[PDB]
C-alpha cells in the first residue's frame, strides 16, 4: 500500500521532487542523476548516509573519498565540453566582439576570458574546504570534551 507505508511514501515523493527539477533546465536529468548519487555520499557524511558501507571495506569512507574525486573531475569537464559544443566561435560566446584590430592583443583578452570561465568553477571548491575545516573543528572539540 503506497499510502500507508511511510517507507515508500518518503522515497516516492522525494524522487518526484528531484526529477521535477528538470524544469530548472540544468541539463539532461538522465545524465547527471548518477552524479547526484555520488555527491550524496560526499555531503551525506554529515548525516551518516555512509553507515551501510562500514563492512564493505576496511575504510568506512571509501565511497565518499572516491565520490569527491568523481565530483571534481566531471564538474571540471562540464566547462570543457561546453566550449567544444560552442565550436571555434567559443571565444565570442564568452567575451563577445573584440575591440582592437591586433589579434595578439585580443589573444591576451581572450585568454583571461577562458581562465575566468574556469575560475568561476574552481573557485567554488574553496567553499567545500570551509565545510570540511569547520566539520573537523567540531569533531576535535567533541572528541576532546571533558569526561572523568
Amino acid at each position: 500500500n503506497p499510502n500507508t507505508e511511510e517507507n515508500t511514501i518518503d522515497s516516492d515523493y522525494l524522487a518526484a521532487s528531484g526529477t521535477v527539477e528538470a524544469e530548472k533546465e540544468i541539463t539532461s536529468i538522465d545524465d547527471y542523476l548518477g552524479l547526484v548519487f555520488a555527491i550524496a555520499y560526499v555531503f551525506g557524511v554529515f548525516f551518516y548516509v555512509h553507515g551501510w558501507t562500514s563492512m564493505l571495506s576496511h575504510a568506512v569512507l571509501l565511497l565518499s573519498c572516491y565520490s569527491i574525486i568523481i565530483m571534481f573531475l566531471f564538474i571540471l569537464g562540464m566547462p570543457t565540453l561546453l566550449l567544444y559544443d560552442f565550436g571555434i566561435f567559443f571565444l565570442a560566446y564568452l567575451k563577445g566582439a573584440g575591440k582592437y584590430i591586433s589579434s595578439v592583443a585580443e589573444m591576451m583578452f581572450d585568454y583571461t576570458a577562458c581562465l575566468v570561465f574556469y575560475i568561476r568553477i574552481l573557485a567554488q571548491w574553496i567553499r567545500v574546504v570551509l565545510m570540511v575545516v569547520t566539520f573537523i573543528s567540531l569533531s576535535h572539540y567533541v572528541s576532546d570534551f571533558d569526561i572523568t
Binding site: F47, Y48, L138, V142, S143, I147
Partner: protein, 55 residues
C-alpha cells in the same frame, strides 16, 4: 504477550551469552562513547530540535 516470561528468559540468555562471550566489553563501551556523543549532538536539531526551535 503470551510468552513474556519465556521470551524474557531467552532475551537475557543471549545477553549473557554475548556478555559471557565478550570479554573485552568495557573496551567496546569506551570505544563507543565518542561517536555516541558526536552523532546525537549533530543530528538532534534535524530530528527533534526542529520541532521546538528555529525551523
Amino acid at each position: 504477550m503470551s510468552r513474556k516470561f519465556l521470551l524474557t528468559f531467552w532475551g537475557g540468555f543471549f545477553v549473557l551469552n554475548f556478555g559471557m562471550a565478550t570479554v573485552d566489553l568495557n573496551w567496546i563501551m569506551k570505544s563507543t562513547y565518542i561517536p555516541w556523543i558526536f552523532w546525537f549532538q549533530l543530528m538532534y536539531f534535524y530530528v527533534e530540535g526542529k520541532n521546538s526551535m528555529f525551523m
